[PDB]
Symmetry: D2
């Protein structure tokens, strides 16, 4: 159903990271990043419905997570401007991508869960 989902967690509060802006880009033929989809994480730290199976073709995608704005709204001084997750989407049978990001003011981790 949903081919690309983003989950964001807050490692300082131990909670979902709510209202985090997320911008997805697709690399164009001229090597520039073209806006593809965007949204804000929900109360559960999830962002669903970014794209459809039809539109999400093979290509290089960048998921930018606006971490600095998130920390600033919480009164915390962070290190990063934003987190970037860059990957190739490949048709190798049925696939769904979940990008999980765990945020700390001076650190972050990201993991991809790719399922059939």
């Amino acid at each position: 159903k949903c081919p690309l989902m983003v989950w964001v967690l807050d490692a300082v509060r131990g909670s979902p990271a709510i209202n985090v802006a997320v911008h997805v880009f697709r690399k164009a033929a001229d090597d520039t990043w073209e806006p593809f989809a965007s949204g804000k994480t929900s109360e559960s730290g999830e962002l669903h419905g970014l794209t459809t199976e039809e539109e999400f073709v093979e290509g290089i995608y960048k998921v930018e997570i606006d971490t600095k704005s998130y920390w600033k709204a919480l009164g915390i001084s962070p290190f990063h401007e934003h987190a970037e997750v860059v990957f190739t989407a490949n048709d190798s049978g049925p696939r769904r991508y979940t990008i999980a990001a765990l945020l700390s003011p001076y650190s972050y981790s990201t993991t991809a869960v790719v399922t059939n």
Copy 2:
């Protein structure tokens, strides 16, 4: 130095100083016997826990006292402590660096094992 612990603070972006660390070794009776202990330095490092002679094969548990660290900084954390349990020197002596990255509700640990 066959066993070292390095600890970083992901909130401050700095070494985690004065973090207590207790190391245990599993005895023949399956209990955890105290093996070594210390506190991280201003660089977040803890050296000199043991010697090549004393660090024989066995199952070791490195307990990093993260709750006491966060409490001293006025932060109420989730975990009591981080626990790193591993078999050491089962294919001969190795040097181990246990790296820990701390957040109030999360931590990560990684081992760098060198021959």
Copy 3:
């Protein structure tokens, strides 16, 4: 509903970590760890139904995740015997705990998501 859930992900395969044994213990008055609940992660890497709101009283709990057996079944030589997550469960209004663990052969990370 479910007060304690465990999620386990595999950072080498980018997938849920399936059939991972998980043992939960509660610290007794004599300072020993008493078995409390156990199970295996599902096809989604989740373990639900470990306990009930009635049984999950305030106390110190240890969640042991049998990572070495998981890696060995995949033909991978890991560092840790198991991962341990030790925490105090506190009544501070309605609370649900999700313990998330991300596994690599020589590293792991754990995060707690505590919600109302």
Copy 4:
């Protein structure tokens, strides 16, 4: 040394050797201008990227070429590269250590900022 990069391999429990790193600085026209580059050593460290004089205030992007690293090891990874984007030296000169921990489908990055 005001900017250093340390990279670890979470699969092998070892430093990640020969990892290419490219650093960019945001120009007045909002484009990313090449700033410095290098490869991690046998210890997983990359030193000497820049000097205190050249490392002025600005927004920097440290690109760690993780896909090329995993491909050279016969592992097909998820990410193209890891990207660490930050404002540097906005309250005066600081020393930055960017630490990255790599797995085929995951990575973590942490910054240690010292004055």
